[PDB]
Design a protein around this ligand. Sequence first.
Ligand SMILES: CNCc1ccc(Oc2cccnc2)o1
Ligand SMILES: CNCc1ccc(Oc2cccnc2)o1
Ligand SMILES: [Zn+2]
Ligand SMILES: [Zn+2]
Lengths: 368, 368
Amino acid sequence: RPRFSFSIAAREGKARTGTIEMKRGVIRTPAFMPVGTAATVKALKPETVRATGADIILGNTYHLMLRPGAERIAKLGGLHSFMGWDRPILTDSGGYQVMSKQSEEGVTFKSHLDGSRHMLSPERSIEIQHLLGSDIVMAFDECTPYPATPSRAASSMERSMRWAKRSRDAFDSRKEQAENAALFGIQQGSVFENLRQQSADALAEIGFDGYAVGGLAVGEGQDEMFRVLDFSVPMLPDDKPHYLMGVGKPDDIVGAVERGIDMFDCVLPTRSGRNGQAFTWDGPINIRNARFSEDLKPLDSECHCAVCQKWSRAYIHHLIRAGEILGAMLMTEHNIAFYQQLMQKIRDSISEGRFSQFAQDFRARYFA
Amino acid sequence: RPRFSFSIAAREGKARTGTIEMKRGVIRTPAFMPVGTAATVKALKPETVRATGADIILGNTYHLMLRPGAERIAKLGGLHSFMGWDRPILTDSGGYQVMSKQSEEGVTFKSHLDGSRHMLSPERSIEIQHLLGSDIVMAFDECTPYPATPSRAASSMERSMRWAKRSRDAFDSRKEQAENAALFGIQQGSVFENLRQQSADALAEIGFDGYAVGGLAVGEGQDEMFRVLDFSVPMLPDDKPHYLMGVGKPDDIVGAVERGIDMFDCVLPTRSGRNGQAFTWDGPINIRNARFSEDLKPLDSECHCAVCQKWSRAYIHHLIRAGEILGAMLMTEHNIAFYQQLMQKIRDSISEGRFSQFAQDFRARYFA
Ligand SMILES: CNCc1ccc(Oc2cccnc2)o1
Ligand SMILES: CNCc1ccc(Oc2cccnc2)o1
Ligand SMILES: [Zn+2]
Ligand SMILES: [Zn+2]
């Protein structure tokens, strides 16, 4: 098994489908990564996450470094062993959650759990991700708020590129990490084409295994997100994965794939599932709504997941209204399975040269 | 399949092991029933409950009648269909939770959920349990607090016996219920031998498929509970199941089986699991305790359950401390599996004529 091999099997327009081969397994792209917060995809055993079709999950470095701590996880054998997921894991850098004292060296912050003081830097972020043992490591960057002035977007992009080089050098200095994991860089530049180009050129000069489009899905809205992707994705190396972080709704994913994105993560299916929102091919529903109290159909009548083979809307409605844990379990399994079935439909349609038609048919029905 | 057939395969002292054959399946005795509150055994899918070895679960009539309502459950096909458990279900009468305007006709009360007004009577309790479709129906009685004066214990026992006859007649008047379900009566009389005898004689004169020992595990403590069981269980018909409601800790169960009890339910494994208490063969542990933060052993190193094959104390410690749903899921599955493994050990030891030795060995290790 190679450390990292991305192969593109088929293309349609800007969309691509293929595989990332890694030591812990193969990732089919375009890929959706369930978010596994503090060493758990909330309300699901790892075997259930896998049963939905997921090939890789995301772990949040910020949360893990506070509880249980990265050093403790390493002492216990790494994140895969600790949580019982043996396939690839991508970890974020920790930086975004710190935002949600700063200087050129990094950031110090007070924990939201107990006020304890912590530090993040390019070097410490890479070290934490080494201690966790993740397979895909994210460079540490400086997030740019939206809206941002051209000057602020430029300064933050520039710092992020300096931090990308430091991330690269820290990762390369760790023999076991450099030999077995992959490192992704993050493009910045807010909504400004010139800064996006400068950022892509700097990241390509440093060299990464994959490239994220950062700084989107932060309040700009879908039209603006799509407009920035239109010019930003073609600036990245074509032969490496393109990762859109923190996206998104099903229609966000489809349009992003149409613009050349290969990888996604988001909290929406898990978080909104626990809150009572179920995804269906006819759009989302809020299962708590009284119209479902006597509806014996499954959440979606075409979904292949185990929840839709076994339980009714009426039952799940009751569980969520009652605040029952099983309600969260069933809604989350369904929503993750829906997302994986969507990614499979995307991969198949690209492989068959009918993705543009799929995207049109999907949108027509989802928005009806 | 018969509506109800209890067969005793083996005895040792006062302890018995056997089977209850019902239309929806066989119940191995002595039996432990997980409690499935509002149409869910909290944090477990029905397939997981079954995988632990449970043959029957309990449903709480009081909670079900308030949310989602018994009429709604019947309209949706009954409780088995609604929650996805196709094996036997025992339902309580609803009366105890009303306690936790009263007259000879029954009780009216305000819902703890929204102040709506409801009514329970012998007839309405049996009707609710018919609407749910449960396989074992509990007669509606009047609970006696502990401590109780002889006069109050007598008056409450007498009312309970009048309500037992009304429960019997209501159940017999419902053709589909009488042909396919079983009806259990409840002995009362507080700690007083004469009232316990009067209660057993009245219940046997009415005739029931099984007999519960009511009014225990309400604050009297184990020694007193055991003393009352010593004289109360031999008063019940020997050839029918003896059910001890709301019991209990592992050592309560063992000593109750030594006194002739065949069936148990309790919230302890589920509720205390969600709160961080795990049962082990060396006694209970509180997984939140810092001594477990780096303990890579499973919850119990001899337990056969899936949780103990896959996850460490250290991981479960973290999940419970973090308030993660998966922590509740894993602790609950383990504790229910522990309880079922205990019942299996009890059944096997009785069947092999070595139950007294098992009980001694169990207590010596559990309390060390
Ligand atoms: C206006 N941006 C100029 C530009 C292109 C690439 C970078 O990134 C840099 C350059 C020098 C120092 N730090 C970051 O800046
Ligand atoms: C002191 N208890 C007398 C006794 C034995 C059985 C019952 O039960 C009764 C008898 C008459 C009316 N109601 C209940 O009472
Ligand atoms: Zn589904
Ligand atoms: Zn176990």
